[PDB]
Amino acid sequence: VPVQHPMYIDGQFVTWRGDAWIDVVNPATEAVISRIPDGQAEDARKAIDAAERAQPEWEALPAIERASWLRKISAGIRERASEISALIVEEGGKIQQLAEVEVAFTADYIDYMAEWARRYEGEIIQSDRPGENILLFKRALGVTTGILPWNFPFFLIARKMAPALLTGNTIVIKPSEFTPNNAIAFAKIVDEIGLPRGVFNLVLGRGETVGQELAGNPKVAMVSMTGSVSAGEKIMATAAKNITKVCLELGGKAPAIVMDDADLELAVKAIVDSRVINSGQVCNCAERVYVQKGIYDQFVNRLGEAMQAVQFGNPAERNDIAMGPLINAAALERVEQKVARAVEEGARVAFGGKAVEGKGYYYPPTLLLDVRQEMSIMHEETFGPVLPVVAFDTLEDAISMANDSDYGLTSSIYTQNLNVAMKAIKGLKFGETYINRENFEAMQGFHAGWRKSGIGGADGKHGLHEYLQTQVVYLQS
Amino acid sequence: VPVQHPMYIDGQFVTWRGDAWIDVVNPATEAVISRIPDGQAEDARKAIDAAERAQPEWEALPAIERASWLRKISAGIRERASEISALIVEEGGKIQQLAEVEVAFTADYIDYMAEWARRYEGEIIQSDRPGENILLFKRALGVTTGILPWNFPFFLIARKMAPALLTGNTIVIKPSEFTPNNAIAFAKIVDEIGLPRGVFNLVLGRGETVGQELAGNPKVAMVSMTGSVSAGEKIMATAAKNITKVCLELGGKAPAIVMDDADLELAVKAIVDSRVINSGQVCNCAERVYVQKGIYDQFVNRLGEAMQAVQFGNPAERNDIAMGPLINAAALERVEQKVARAVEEGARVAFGGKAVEGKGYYYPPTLLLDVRQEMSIMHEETFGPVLPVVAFDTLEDAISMANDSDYGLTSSIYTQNLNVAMKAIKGLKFGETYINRENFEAMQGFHAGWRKSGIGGADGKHGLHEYLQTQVVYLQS
Amino acid sequence: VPVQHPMYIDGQFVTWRGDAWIDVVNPATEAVISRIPDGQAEDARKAIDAAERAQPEWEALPAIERASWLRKISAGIRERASEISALIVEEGGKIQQLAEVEVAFTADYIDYMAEWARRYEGEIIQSDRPGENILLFKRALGVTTGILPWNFPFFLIARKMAPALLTGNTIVIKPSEFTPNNAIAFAKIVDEIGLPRGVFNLVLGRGETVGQELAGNPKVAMVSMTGSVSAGEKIMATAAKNITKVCLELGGKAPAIVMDDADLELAVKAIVDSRVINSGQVCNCAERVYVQKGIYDQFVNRLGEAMQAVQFGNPAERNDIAMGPLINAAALERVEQKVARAVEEGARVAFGGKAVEGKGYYYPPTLLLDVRQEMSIMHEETFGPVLPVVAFDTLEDAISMANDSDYGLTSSIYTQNLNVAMKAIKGLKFGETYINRENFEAMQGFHAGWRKSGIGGADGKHGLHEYLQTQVVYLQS
Amino acid sequence: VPVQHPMYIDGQFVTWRGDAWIDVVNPATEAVISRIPDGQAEDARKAIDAAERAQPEWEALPAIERASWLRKISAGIRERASEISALIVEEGGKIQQLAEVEVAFTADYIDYMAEWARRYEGEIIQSDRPGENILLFKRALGVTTGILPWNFPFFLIARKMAPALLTGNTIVIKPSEFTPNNAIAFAKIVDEIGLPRGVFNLVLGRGETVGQELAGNPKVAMVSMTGSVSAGEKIMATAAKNITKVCLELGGKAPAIVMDDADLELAVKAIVDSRVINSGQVCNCAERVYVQKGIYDQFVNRLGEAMQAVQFGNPAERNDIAMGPLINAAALERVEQKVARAVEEGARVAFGGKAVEGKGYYYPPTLLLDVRQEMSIMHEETFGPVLPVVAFDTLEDAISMANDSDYGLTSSIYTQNLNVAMKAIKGLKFGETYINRENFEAMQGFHAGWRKSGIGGADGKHGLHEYLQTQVVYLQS
């Protein structure tokens, strides 16, 4: 029977008494795998108030002790890696290999963030006043909130809660309505190790209800969210009411530039190895491929060939496939319309292009050629495993077309010339630029997007600092 | 005849052709000293588009060259210090000594920010990938905007434009509708030295018109503003539409804690020397004074006495006064209502308390005693030179009442015990904490408020970084 | 039978064929517990050449992989904590509780240093040259050497090898001639986990022979040593021949200042809890106690009383004692002469003072009063558990007498006044200053002494950086 | 009449009463241009004691005030640029254009170092102890000393005194025996502006006398010196006696690598524009040129041609020459022997090679071909304007031969391939690596050599920090 999940508030699971429920489905089979409460603002507040009551003592704990708690959580996750991976596979529809890697990476991530305990520092600044000391301490924000999407849901829990908890903050996470299972599992692990009550809270429900509360509540020092530009806009607008800080990651349209002097094998491999790191969906995966004439011909063929081998199907019954289904009906439909609409503007369907009609939501890896910068397929979050390929004459053109977007999170260039690389770097307006390799942010790097791609960022030292604020003390004599 | 100011766009003053005009008045005499255009969104866009066209080349300039331009501007300001001070005095109504100091400080500030040219740095992070380099470059945001208030208007130009220009950004400033004169003077200096066209733009008008455009325009990478929580809320909400970054400083209710073991002379002096650093108005000046029983009696008397000597009048005709008039009618009225409303709740008028009726907007330094944390005078931006004094029993009480506010920008404590100081520091939830001295942020410190007091910050290295974003490059082999 | 230890070179223990041997004795029983080769320069070179051959590949390993090796070593140490502690107790003569803590701390230390893998960074500096990038990479020094003393020998292995190995260096350690056993045990653990050959090398022998080679060999990029000023002088002088970098920690005469307004209980406790963290010997333990008249009387009595409870004896047969014997005959004799010589100058023996004559080398906790800054007991490395107590009138006096020394490693002050603390801090010329607590350097702090106390330092980020050098790259276009 | 210079000690020039004098000569004309005292240790001590008496108050000054003094000195230097340049030209024998640039750069340098006043910072580290603060303050070393060489003597005054003075140190400089005039001029400027007495001291004499005292005096916290490896060895060995810190820059044998895919014009230009930035003498100038077969032929011809245009002669009577004479007879002779000795081993004299016999010390730009890594001309400080050119087959060869040296200060590579550049960077063991440009260290970079090239470094933030030490405060509650 499809299990009914309770929320995790103030150190204890609480059974939802409400009358309405949200059904969680398997994108592959399309059946009901579980049910979560249709939580409301009042639920979020219970969690926020608990987070608030527990924040002073949690922060009073030496950073090293907080790191210790984080290590117990990562340890709990490893002991249950397969159980958690299967949940990710089941509700997210991502291939088994990917799920396992997500679970391992998330545990390695929490451990990497635990290591900041004795390393984040404040500063001692020289004053102009005789005998005066200016101390700059790094304090915690207080209560923080996390609103996660269905892509990489398990990891996104750690990316937000780990930094927050290490710095002395308390957090209230709202997993995605479509992928709440891994979150429940995470809360079970938090419960087992016994993390202090209120430090970590999990509230189930919809973004418009539980999400808006996680952003508009006056007690929240900062609301962190990952997803679509649209939701980021509603979250920032609501946070505005209380001058609440925000941490947004709205992905985008990752562009990739392939020069003639580029290792043909590497580029094709890297772009393919990227793109479908789920079903395609992932935003840091080359959604816009720019190729110059001199190599266009060869590049397209190898690429076209590489994409055919990519088979799709139920992730749980197939460990030999490279693509699971899409997260849901809405996602599948939008991919069709956008592809169809694209072909009407001149898009040349070189591969796939026709939505599969049957149990689950699948879309064959599609390849669009003769695409133009002007076309609407270039200025929208594609979703599906679609790859538009626009030809270009020179680096200046390529850089100009890549920078031509409302998104500026991830970019990549495949070349071999010292000036081209350095010129592309200095020219590309993105938070990230991969040179001759696949797009996958390192935990010690800094995931932050320019323009509409976001505000603030994640990972590494700067990601950690997003959860700290400063207290400048002017100690006169 | 009251002069009519043109706007400064794309390297040249432009005469406003519109039919409507905004009258600039002298808070002291109450007469019309000049007129500024009632600018509209389209005006702001002309400036933004110019700022956008000029940004690439400006950033392409070596940081040292940009610093050079900034030094010419500071040099221009010093050559015209008196002229600019008198403008500040005239329209802002602040005492002459204060105006001169503002002009000198602002010039020293621009020079201090110019020194960051060769000092702000990116980082080289160790990768887990064999032979891979992770470079983290600091790039400019692009086009930025500044929306200034009437308090410290001249300096606030530099606090926003200096950091922005040094890092490679272009800016569009909208001075306050009540204090645009000093801004025009600043633009004249920018024009004289010949700063590259578009790098610095000045647009006149109202916040609801020209301000909303400076915040909602998709071409703006970041909008910086200083003023009231209310305006910050409208600015952040509008910036939300384009996920535009924001830099807000909404002042607050600066609290001050006086312990018994506190140098009575110093505290009284510091609190008085602060408070009226204009007419009172300044937000970093002890608006909430907490005193403990053991010293309450003596502290109130010396304080009461110190406040009587504070005389008010026209800043231009009086260099022996300690207080000019309030910025305008609205400000004066609110101060009255709030004082009256306060006395009804139990507030004991120990000094002043009655609004002066005549040319200009003056309010005698007022002292409210027997005030309670509960009273509404404690939870609002007082404006006028009013000082509520609430008694308290112990440090825990004092800290708890100081932290009890929607604002968390500035705080201060007067004591002598090593544990008290360290306990107050660790306990106070403010961006700043002054110990045994008056509240005046150092240029190399970091002016940033907790809670509703703001987002991001200003001054020092961290202030400089608010104008930089990161570009993480993954150079694989 | 007293075991004969082989050296650990190029990933394998090697049996010493030489004819001479150095006898290792138990300071408590005075019997031969083991024997180590009387190594010569040629032995050190074999190790250095191995370290050199292995350095390129070791450094080529991603920092995270090197950290992984370090974690295996710490894990090995914990699995054998008791075995290693007993060795420390046996040859070093330190009380059991201390040995266990040393073994645990050293393992926690290696793990703390392993966490620097993805955190130490180079920088990207703004150039004045159009289109030029200045990259500042942090590279490894190459081959490094460590020369350890008998105090905290086990930990001192990790304090030198952990930072070196994490940054990509290879190392050659020479344990102390009197305490080589724990080192052999450490090498066995390195061997078991299989650390790459040459990365870690252990060479046994005397300082004048194997030590001089570890410092004068042209292949050594840096020689790190901990011990007496005299040895530091011979090591630096030899390193001079090849402009070899040096890292010295020569301890000193840690002074402690007790003010009248100081928690009498805390000070007496902290000074006693310190001093004898072995037999006394430790250099960071208040070897010079300054007390002011107003509290002198009481402080001396409680202190005198606290010292009587400190019993001495064989660490292995007594877990109820607070002091083991001294490292050897020479140390015991010097303590006597210095005490006797001190009493002749006016020193008042308030407790102990008479060397015990029998198996082992013991010296009763001794207390010298009426001591004067002038006396020679204040300007020499006391060694034994002796405590001179000099009276003083004011802070200026106390600070001046504390700063009056050739050593500037550790200091401490017990007071409660905000100005006194801040005044003592700004006045004391030491690398460390403890306020109201016992002297024990934190792993994330920075152990570095002023004047003759050393060069460079250890622990924390700065300790880590001593093993890194910079490579500034000027990439023009 | 050849003027006789007095020393500058404790804020006042002091006339040398000794009987012996050292004659200063003009390398071009060879006549006596002035005379300096043959100072002795006692003279150096007078300066050190003055530096010591003045250090506390100087450091007590807010950093900004010290920076102010530094700006007055730079201002003084500009007002007397020509006077100072002519002195440099006269005694150093460097071409006029170079002297002027040195004087301007040194003044810009002092100003750049003055900007560190409010920027160098200490840190606030997280402790594991409940309620404990770890403050890490940056304090001054105390008294420092500078021992300068004849190359870039004026600038080397600022490179050592500017960082030292800004951080709160006092200094005692000993200019080079052959180039003391510019130093006297600098002291006159220090005197005119009125720098506090003792902060800056100038002592004339020989290295073996006044230099040894500047290094062996127990009151010196650190001795900074620039010159030959030999002198560095004597200075470090002497400093060893008191565990005195040292800052050495012993230049070396700067190698340069020219790949086939390298802009022939640029490389030839850069190597020529470098080399003779005086008479040749400069150590950061390609003293070892590595060229690969594929381009060897062409590279040698253009280079040979470029070197012919380089004319030599008296710098004061010729503003159309590219090379002045050598510093003295000894330097000229060594250049001959080494060239002659080189030709005997197989060196092919492609240009120049014969020492000019007449007034002054000149050596025609010489070009040695068919040189082998083995030859002794590759393993010695050439001095003269000699250029050995060794052919090589691949990058690995080139990198291996460049790294094959006891010196590791400066390196350069001329290529265009992204992998070659990145491979050369990661492979070259030098403190600096220039890519496609001439060798000239930036003031905000970091001049520090690997191996025998030095200890510590200069310029930029890290150069500044060499003059600071740390004070870790453990404030428990």
Ligand SMILES: NC(=O)C1=CN([C@@H]2O[C@H](COP(=O)(O)OP(=O)(O)OC[C@H]3O[C@@H](n4cnc5c(N)ncnc54)[C@H](OP(=O)(O)O)[C@@H]3O)[C@@H](O)[C@H]2O)C=CC1
């Ligand atoms: N009504 C519908 O049918 C719609 C469905 N979608 C789905 O969302 C996908 C988009 O990708 P995704 O990465 O999930 O990103 P989203 O932008 O949808 O954001 C997902 C996360 O943001 C929360 N959120 C959504 N709206 C708000 C809001 N107004 N205020 C606060 N939080 C909010 C979500 O809640 P929650 O999980 O409750 O959505 C979830 O936690 C689509 O592909 C589609 O599957 C998108 C729009 C409409």
Ligand SMILES: NC(=O)C1=CN([C@@H]2O[C@H](COP(=O)(O)OP(=O)(O)OC[C@H]3O[C@@H](n4cnc5c(N)ncnc54)[C@H](OP(=O)(O)O)[C@@H]3O)[C@@H](O)[C@H]2O)C=CC1
């Ligand atoms: N006796 C002779 O004839 C010798 C002359 N030289 C000259 O020195 C040049 C080397 O270049 P340069 O850059 O000047 O570098 P050096 O290594 O000669 O060092 C020059 C600076 O170091 C000082 N110094 C030299 N020896 C010592 C010492 N033992 N202890 C402390 N300080 C010392 C010098 O003093 P000072 O200026 O007094 O030398 C000077 O301030 C040669 O080309 C040659 O012209 C070198 C060796 C011997």
